[PDB]
């Protein structure tokens, strides 16, 4: 947001246009430049933690505790590579915990109740009708508050019996990342990978 | 009901110099641009259009005057000016100060005009804030129209100079004066004088013959007080126009359009907004007026 105070006006746009390219021509194929440079192992670390901060984390389920690691910590997200890039990142960055926790079922949406009533006549319906109903039939004119809404926001995600899921983990800053490669599922079936590109 | 109070935030504490001029004019008129409670000083004075290092003309300034809202001072605290506004129908306390002093009464008739005599008298400069403040000037409308007369006349005679006792000294009975013309802008004064050709030569297109026949009877031997302008001699033109026989329904069609175009000449001699004052004390120098932008 350092550039976007005064909006996209005609000078702001081309100032952004000339700064794709100082970021393109330098930082393209960043892992390949890291060989012939002096520093290396730190210069890649300020490309992940570059990328990890650039993602807009507008997760509405940020209040929801879906994928925790062991000892109740937090999973930020998942980067997925080929195998040869997974060879590099496993060297520079460890496999620090290697066992995450998470649900092992789905979340059932069922049109039992008065949703079925609005389903038959009307070509539109709802979700969580009773939780939607008590806001108006019994409890209006109270504020939208967090503690009175976060527990009624999931429809499954406090109820599924969670279990251990074996995968690779890594720590950057504090945001834990899981690392995967999808070629075992694709180079057994003779279909090409989309990560290769 | 409605409120109005425009307090003016200011970035630097004033001196002891220019408080004493602003303490003197505790009630006056100065128009601003942004209609809110808080305001930067670079909008208060008129000098956004009339500064020193330009060549301002008093057409465009006066043209600028009819746009803005108008406002009245309450206090001068050494940081914060405190002002009150002028709604499109609202009574207030105006309290005149202005230095070529004219006398008012109750049931008088006012206007708002630019500083037309002495800017150095009418403007104080704010060297502790950079931006200067230019005051406007309130004048009764008989003299409020009389100043605009010679201004539209002077820009004509300045063009033919491509000497001064006749073309500048705006007269009232009792006091003549002197306009403030050395560096003006004769282009938007020319645009107003452009449009008079679009009336005055068209007012010459339907001139009634019987009314010209009357001046072949008035100034020859049947004279009057207000006809001394001709000084007893007919012009050359009226001997050339009145050869036709009169008939009434010719001039009936004529005088109806002469009735109409003179209604259009209001559009070129407009003042700013107008002030109809109903009560006026003489020793407090206060007044009472309902404002009407028009």
């Amino acid at each position: 947001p350092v550039y976007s105070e005064r909006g996209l006006k005609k000078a702001v746009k081309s100032d952004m246009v000339s700064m794709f390219k100082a970021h393109l021509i330098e930082h393209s194929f960043f892992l390949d430049k890291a060989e012939l440079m002096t520093r290396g192992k730190q210069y890649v670390l300020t490309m992940l933690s570059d990328m990890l901060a650039a993602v807009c984390e507008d997760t509405v389920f940020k209040g929801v505790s879906t994928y925790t690691t062991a000892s109740g910590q937090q999973v930020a997200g998942v980067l997925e590579t080929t195998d040869s890039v997974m060879r590099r990142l496993m060297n520079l960055l460890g496999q620090v915990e290697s066992a995450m926790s998470g649900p092992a079922a789905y979340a059932s949406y069922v049109v039992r109740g008065a949703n079925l009533v609005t389903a038959v006549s009307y070509g539109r319906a709802m979700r969580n009708f009773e939780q939607f109903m008590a806001r108006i039939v019994d409890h209006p004119n109270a504020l939208p508050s967090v503690e009175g809404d976060k527990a009624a926001l999931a429809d499954g995600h406090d109820e599924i019996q969670r279990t251990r899921i074996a995968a690779s983990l890594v720590k950057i800053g504090d945001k834990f990342v899981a690392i995967e490669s999808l070629q075992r599922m694709y180079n057994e079936t003779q279909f090409p990978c989309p990560l290769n590109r | 009901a409605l409120d109005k109070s425009i307090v003016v935030n200011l970035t630097s504490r004033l001196f002891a110099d220019e408080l004493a001029a602003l303490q003197s004019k505790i009630g006056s008129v100065l128009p601003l641009g942004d209609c809110h409670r808080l305001q930067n000083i670079q909008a208060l004075g008129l000098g956004c259009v009339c500064s020193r290092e330009t060549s301002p003309d008093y057409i465009q300034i006066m043209q600028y005057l009819s746009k803005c809202t108008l406002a009245v001072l309450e206090e001068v605290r050494p940081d914060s000016l405190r002002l009150t506004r002028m709604d499109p129908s609202d009574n207030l306390q105006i309290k005149n100060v202005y230095a070529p002093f004219f006398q008012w009464d109750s049931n008088t008739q006012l206007a708002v005009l630019p500083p037309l005599f002495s800017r150095k008298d009418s403007t104080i400069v704010l060297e502790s804030n950079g931006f200067d403040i230019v005051f406007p000037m309130v004048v009764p409308q008989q003299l409020g129209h009389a100043i605009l007369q010679q201004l539209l006349v002077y820009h004509i005679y300045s063009k033919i100079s491509a000497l001064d006792l006749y073309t500048t000294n705006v007269s009232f009975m009792g006091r003549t004066y002197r306009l403030d013309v050395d560096n003006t802008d004769p282009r938007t004064a020319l645009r107003v004088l452009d449009d008079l050709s679009m009336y005055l030569c068209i007012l010459s297109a339907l001139v009634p013959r019987g009314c010209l026949r009357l001046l072949t009877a008035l100034v020859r031997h049947d004279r009057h007080p207000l006809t001394e302008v001709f000084e007893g001699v007919v012009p050359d033109e009226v001997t050339r126009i009145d050869l036709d026989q009169l008939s009434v329904p010719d001039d009936i069609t004529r005088m109806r359009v002469m009735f109409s175009y003179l209604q259009s000449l209001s559009s070129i001699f407009n003042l700013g907004p107008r002030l109809h004052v109903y009560a006026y004390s003489a020793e407090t120098l206060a007044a009472s007026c309902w404002y009407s932008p028009r």
């Binding site: 509405v60 949703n115 070509g123 539109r124 319906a125 709802m126 979700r127 939208p144 508050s145 967090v146 | 605290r77 050494p78």
Partner: protein, 49 residues
């Protein structure tokens, strides 16, 4: 065609006193700027020789 997830923003309130910008402040409560004009702090700098 149903309705799935109907969401808001909730904006919190960070006041001035709870920040620590106010180490560049001394926050006195005060009642009437609608009276007070200015302020005055006085000093004496006695210089030895």
């Amino acid at each position: 065609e149903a309705l799935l997830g109907v969401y808001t923003n909730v904006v919190e309130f960070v006041k001035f006193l709870e920040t620590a910008l106010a180490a560049a402040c001394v926050n006195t409560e005060f009642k009437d700027l609608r009276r007070m004009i200015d302020g005055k702090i006085q000093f004496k700098i006695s210089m030895p020789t």
